[PDB]
């Protein structure tokens with residue numbers, strides 16, 4: 001009945017995530033502390049055990065969704081994944097907040113005692129930010145109105161969930177023990193933080209001019225974030241209080257992309273290597289081709305998500321004639337193959 | 349069991365004029381089912397799925413490639429539409445009808461979507477792309493088996509392949525300025541589109557309106573640029589299920605011969621292109637022409653053969669009869 | 672050889688006036704329906720296109736009249752249903768299977784004679800999809816008719832076990 005440690009869970013994620021050290025510590029410590037809180041259940045000397053949610057921040061295609069999915073594999077309690085862009089303020093045409101709890105029970109097979117001990121994740125949280133700039137009569141619903149509904153959910157209270165797909169029977173489900181991991185790529189947040197921190201100068205002659213912001217520093221700038229910086233973005237102070245912990249994820253570097261195709265077991269290189277291993281054929285991928293693929297990805301400003309297009313576009317012809325081909329034991333791909341000038345060398 | 353070369357020939361029998369698209373679907377479907385025969389038991393655990401994205405004009409045979417492929421492969425297949433807040437559960441239950449409410453057999457089925465560009469730029473517009481993201485990656489949806497037990501069956505969405513079909517409008521202008529040349533308005537500046545679509549990339553799709561997260565799930569790309577005029581004639585002659593052969597077979601049991609000269613088929617190509625609808629707007633041209641002939645053919649006696657001329661399509665003349 | 676397209680148009684002219692083009696279309700589809708069932712799927716042409724009818728016209732144009740006048744001239748039974756009272760999931764309003772039940776009453780429970788029957792529906796616009804305001808009178812009803820039109824078998828209690836009655840051979844208007 002031994003629970004996993006923060007070091008053990010961190011090593012498990014290293015085999016599926018690359019280039020994110022500070023964020024791994026938060027999820028490991030939070031998930032570790034989560035098991036302890038639910039396990040004790042105000043039975044030990046420690047009475048009224050609190051809760052601490054997590055707020056992930058990082059650019060697009062940085063790996064936020066990856067940590068949420070890979071973590072659920074080793075996680076014992078259930079896990080779900082939703083989006084807040086479709087939520088509405090209790091009555092509009094779009095959606096209801098309790099739909100999140102409905103998807104949670106599907107993973108737990110309608111086990112209330114087991115669902116309360118589960119974990120929940122939210123994606124695209126930046127879309128919830130104030131839209132109208134200190135709103136007017138329009139009564140923003142997609143924005144501010146959504147945060148107010150979540151306030152009680154994140155803190156803890158009973159709710160109502162349809163049993164088998166309704167919209168006259170509702171079951172109560174507490175949420176004080178349920179954890180939430182909100183995350184969404186924020187747009188323009190770097191500008192807001194930079195403008196606030198690095199400026200103490202007027203435009204006139206007498207005012208002194210502070211020399212700062214020499215480099216962009218996207219990774220090091222988000223580290224200096226604070227709740228007041230988010231208020232200018234559009235978030236409410238009450239909502240930020242429900243999410244005390246913060247995590248800053250750095251963008252992807254060129255060399256980082258090479259590691260993603262070699263270190264993790266789910267790398268596409270290992271997938272295609274195993275795709276031909278069943279056929280009794282070997283595969284190879286030289287460094288001359290991997291570094292070039294990273295340049296094509298950054299050139300297209302698509303990131304690691306749009307990386308399969310570069311691989312499948314090259315091996316399209318080879319995969320077509322490979323099944324019919326016989327007496328072929330190994331295939332070698334070169335940098336020229338990625339450009340398309342040459343064809344991958346085949347070993348008979 | 350099949351091979352890319354074997355499936356290419358079968359597709360060729362019912363489809364023509366699209367050579368590059370055949371190799372794309374062949375290797376894709378081949379490796380897709382390979383993962384089902386052998387899953388995570390090999391060293392390459394958690395083999396990811398490769399979705400497919402078709403790009404071509406309307407009536408360019410986008411639906412036939414998915415529909416005909418489904419017939420060849422003994423697996424279920426349904427047809428979805430981008431018009432149908434989430435409204436994503438209807439697509440799952442729609443597939444179980446053909447599969448007789450089977451979990452494993454349905455999971456290996458394929459699904460097709462039409463008018464995928466209609467949502468690019470609200471819960472029915474851009475809100476649909478965001479919802480599909482999880483569907484095109486893997487999830488489970490409740491589906492009442494038989495309609496009703498008070499229970500539901502779980503059907504993963506990682507094994508089911510998706511083919512997002514559609515026709516992008518104005519995409520040619522986006523790629524021209526980015527790759528070929530910035531022109532169209534100047535004097536020296538240059539004032540088929542198919543060749544341009546081959547050089548398409550995901551970066552151009554972002555300016556079109558699509559979401560990069562949505563495009564990342566579909567690395568495969570297909571270019572059903574256009575259909576040739578002769579191909580239309582071949583479409584009515586090479587496929588065994590051609591409409592020309594249907595009417596020919598319709599009158600065979602009646603004991604009357606039918607004919608279709610080449611000088612009459614070329615006119616149908618002009619009316620088809622004039623409507624900018626492709627092969628879908630073909631029966632309207634045929635059924636509207638043969639309506640007069642079919643109306644009085646049973647009444648007429650001692651007629652063994654019928655000939656349709658080019659003038660007949662226009663309607664100015666009457667189809668020649670043979671006694 | 673009871674039906675003649677040249678004669679069927681002459682008979683409708685007695686009871687209907689002002690629609691010459693529409694009368695020609697019905698004579699072709701109606702004649703093609705029985706011409707097909709005379710030799711079912713035995714010809715060389717495989718995957719033959721299904722023959723159905725879609726009447727579209729303004730008010731008082733005679734849509735409902737053609738359905739009634741046709742049945743009188745015709746021998747096979749006829750039914751006149753409506754999409755306004757149809758519901759889904761066995762609700763209190765009505766079920767799609769009721770259309771098959773009424774057909775047998777006209778045919779006196781003759782499956783061989785019922786498969787060659789005609790079907791007519793009015794106010795098809797009512798089942799048109801609408802944005803969410805549950806909506807039972809909509810897409811759900813269309814799905815039942817779609818699987819029913821594409822050809823299937825539906826349970827029918829004989830005389831009020833159940834009987835299976837194919838529908839790929841039954842016409843729909």
Ligand SMILES: Nc1ncnc2c1ncn2[C@@H]1O[C@H](COP(=O)(O)OP(=O)(O)OP(O)(O)=S)[C@@H](O)[C@H]1O
Nearest residue numbers: 017018059060061062063064065066185260304561
């Ligand atoms: N650190 C990483 N290591 C390996 N693969 C990664 C990493 N980060 C991103 N990826 C790849 O990018 C894909 C998408 O990751 P996501 O977590 O969705 O990125 P993202 O920043 O969350 O984008 P969003 O959620 O739309 S803002 C993953 O399935 C991986 O293939």
Ligand SMILES: Nc1ncnc2c1ncn2[C@@H]1O[C@H](COP(=O)(O)OP(=O)(O)OP(O)(O)=S)[C@@H](O)[C@H]1O
Nearest residue numbers: 686687688689729730731732733734735736737793
């Ligand atoms: N072509 C016609 N010739 C003669 N009388 C007609 C014609 N069409 C309609 N009528 C008259 O209108 C009455 C109703 O005809 P209907 O077929 O119900 O018209 P309708 O347009 O089909 O109505 P709906 O909207 O389809 S229920 C008939 O009983 C006739 O008196």
Ligand SMILES: Nc1ncnc2c1ncn2[C@@H]1O[C@H](COP(=O)(O)OP(=O)(O)O)[C@@H](O)[C@H]1O
Nearest residue numbers: 362363364406407408409410411412583627628
């Ligand atoms: N290359 C082709 N060969 C044979 N038939 C074709 C071809 N392209 C289109 N068709 C015809 O077009 C019809 C399907 O059109 P569809 O693909 O649904 O149009 P859209 O893609 O605009 O929905 C089929 O009946 C098919 O016979």
